[PDB]
Amino acid sequence: RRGALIVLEGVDRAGKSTQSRKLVEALCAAGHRAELLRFPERSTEIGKLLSSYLQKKSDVEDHSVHLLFSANRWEQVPLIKEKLSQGVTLVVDRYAFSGVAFTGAKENFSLDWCKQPDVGLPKPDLVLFLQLQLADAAKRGAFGHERYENGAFQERALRCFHQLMKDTTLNWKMVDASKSIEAVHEDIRVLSEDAIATATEKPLGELWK
């Protein structure tokens, strides 16, 4: 009985990392086998180049860095497929949707070109999009010092996310991330339990194909 592939995506300070950690903890306390993953996975050779870029310690050509972000997901595909086939549910903090939205926010990058490197990846069984209003996010502290952490760029990324959500091939679920950590967690947890039951019924899909 395979595990489910659950992805969390969402606006800045929406709570992707907090909610991914709390979801894995709750699923395991409820008897599931679940594990956390994140992208970028900064531990690999590729992930180190990506972390340096995001920290502004290095500059990388925009197409090259887009392809590195995708390559960073493909290097984990053998692990992802092994874990799911062994019955482990994977909760993933960011995936291909962030890859497309962030590069797609830059000038002269079509959504089509951005998606192609990730075509074929393991298709999530559930994509949670944590929605939040700029005013409510502002109360979660200040902007980071990493690349892309500015209002005008986040807004362009958000528009790209909305284009991606028009894709009905995917099981998108909107989450009101403005509530408390615990309330948001309960909404995500219940959606996740339903997805896990259902993932055991259809084979793992392929993204965007």
Ligand X SMILES: Nc1ncnc2c1ncn2[C@@H]1O[C@H](COP(=O)(O)OP(=O)(O)O)[C@@H](O)[C@H]1O
Residues lying near Mg ion in the complex (CB under 5 A): 16-17
User: Which one of ligand 2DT, its own copies, ligand X, none interacts with residue 98, CB within 5 to 8 A by kind?
Assistant: ligand 2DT
| Residue pair 111/100 in contact by the 8 Å Cβ criterion | yes
> If you ran DSSP here, which 8-state letter would residue 116 be given?
G
Specify the residue, 202 or 209, whose C-beta has the smaller distance to its own copies. 209
Q: What is the C-alpha separation between 61 and 30, in angstroms, rounded?
A: 45
Is position 14 annotated in a ligand binding site?
A: yes
Q: Which span sits near ligand X by CB under 6 A: 14-22, 101-109, 150-158, 160-168?
A: 14-22
For tokens 């969390």, name the residue.
Answer: 8
**Residue whose C-alpha is closest to residue 194's, from 20, 6, 35, 25:** 6
14 binds, among its own copies, ligand X, Mg ion, none (CB under 5 to 8 A by kind): ligand X
Residues in contact with ligand 2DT, counted by CB under 6 A, come to a total of: 9
Task: Tell me the three state secondary structure of residue 44.
Answer: coil
Closest distance between ligand X and the C-beta of residue 145, in Å? 13
- 184's contact among Mg ion, ligand X, its own copies, none, with CB below 5 to 8 A by partner kind, is ligand X
Cis previous bond, 40, omega within 30? yes
Identified binder of ligand X from the candidate list 78, 180, 201, 209, rule CB under 6 A:
180
Q: Establish if 40 lies at the interface with ligand 2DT (CB under 6 A).
A: yes
What are the start-end ranges of the E strands in 74-183?
A: 89-93, 122-123, 126-131, 172-176
| 69 is an interface residue for ligand 2DT by CB under 6 A | yes
Closest of 21, 15, 9 to residue 177, by C-alpha: 15
Question: Known binder of ligand: residue 30?
Answer: no
Task: Report the alpha-carbon distance of residue 4 to residue 11 in Å, rounded.
Answer: 23
List residues binding its own copies (CB under 8 A). Answer: 45-46, 49, 60-61, 63-65, 67-68, 70-72, 74-75, 77-78, 113, 116-117, 119-120
